[PDB]
Amino acid sequence: GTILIDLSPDDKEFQSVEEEMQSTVREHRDGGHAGGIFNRYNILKIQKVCNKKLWERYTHRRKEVSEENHNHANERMLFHGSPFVNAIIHKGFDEMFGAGIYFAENSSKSNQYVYGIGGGTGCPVHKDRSCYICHRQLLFCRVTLGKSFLQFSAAHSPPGHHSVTGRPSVNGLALAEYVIYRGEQAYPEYLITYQIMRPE
Ligand SMILES: CN(C)CC(=O)Nc1ccc2[nH]c(=O)c3ccccc3c2c1
Numbered sequence: 001g002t003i004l005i006d007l008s009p010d011d012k013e014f015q016s017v018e019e020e021m022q023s024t025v026r027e028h029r030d031g032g033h034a035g036g037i038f039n040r041y042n043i044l045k046i047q048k049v050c051n052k053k054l055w056e057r058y059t060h061r062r063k064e065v066s067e068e069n070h071n072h073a074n075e076r077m078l079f080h081g082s083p084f085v086n087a088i089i090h091k092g093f094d095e096m097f098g099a100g101i102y103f104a105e106n107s108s109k110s111n112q113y114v115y116g117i118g119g120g121t122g123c124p125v126h127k128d129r130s131c132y133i134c135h136r137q138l139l140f141c142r143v144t145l146g147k148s149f150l151q152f153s154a155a156h157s158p159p160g161h162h163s164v165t166g167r168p169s170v171n172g173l174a175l176a177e178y179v180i181y182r183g184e185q186a187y188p189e190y191l192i193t194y195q196i197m198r199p200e
């Protein structure tokens with residue numbers, strides 16, 4: 001029962017999401033090996049994901065979490081990159097910091113997983129991990145963290161916790177990464193279609 005509502009570029013909801021994509025790009029310690037070499041994206045399309053089943057399932061668990069955490073869901077908007085975005089938007093999320101589902105504040109970190117682990121073999125057409133041509137897709141997701149276990153960084157949550165926060169302890173300009181272990185603690189709210197852009 002998933003529908004995808006296309007947002008117009010002049011829509012304020014389109015604009016606030018593009019600005020989160022763009023302003024959270026960083027350099028990566030692999031010099032672009034996994035995700036490509038770029039400072040910004042070309043946003044081709046932003047679609048709002050509407051699914052009543054999956055939404056109700058998210059909100060039910062969010063209420064459970066907040067009740068176990070002094071009425072605080074600790075809800076964030078985070079990026080998720082995966083080859084299986086198609087399954088995720090229709091079926092929901094299913095089952096470094098464990099065997100959970102990973103999310104990032106840096107859009108460019110999630111971009112490293114679009115074609116698979118460590119960027120896989122790159123795009124299906126050119127086998128190029130820095131392809132400036134093929135169309136990529138990321139999810140921008142509403143995620144319930146509850147009480148998050150702090151991990152200073154370079155299955156189930158820990159007892160009494162609802163998620164893990166990977167705090168970058170060495171990396172200079174990195175933002176945080178997060179892990180949940182219950183698929184129903186995240187709702188995929190926007191599907192973003194884009195290309196990475198070659199520096200001039
Ligand atoms: C056991 N690991 C090789 C599996 C793994 O790394 N899976 C995986 C799979 C997909 C992932 N997608 C992300 O957007 C992401 C963002 C920040 C950190 C990790 C991820 C991410 C991680």
Ligand SMILES: [Zn+2]
Pocket residue numbers: 123124125126127128131132133134
């Ligand atoms: Zn390509």
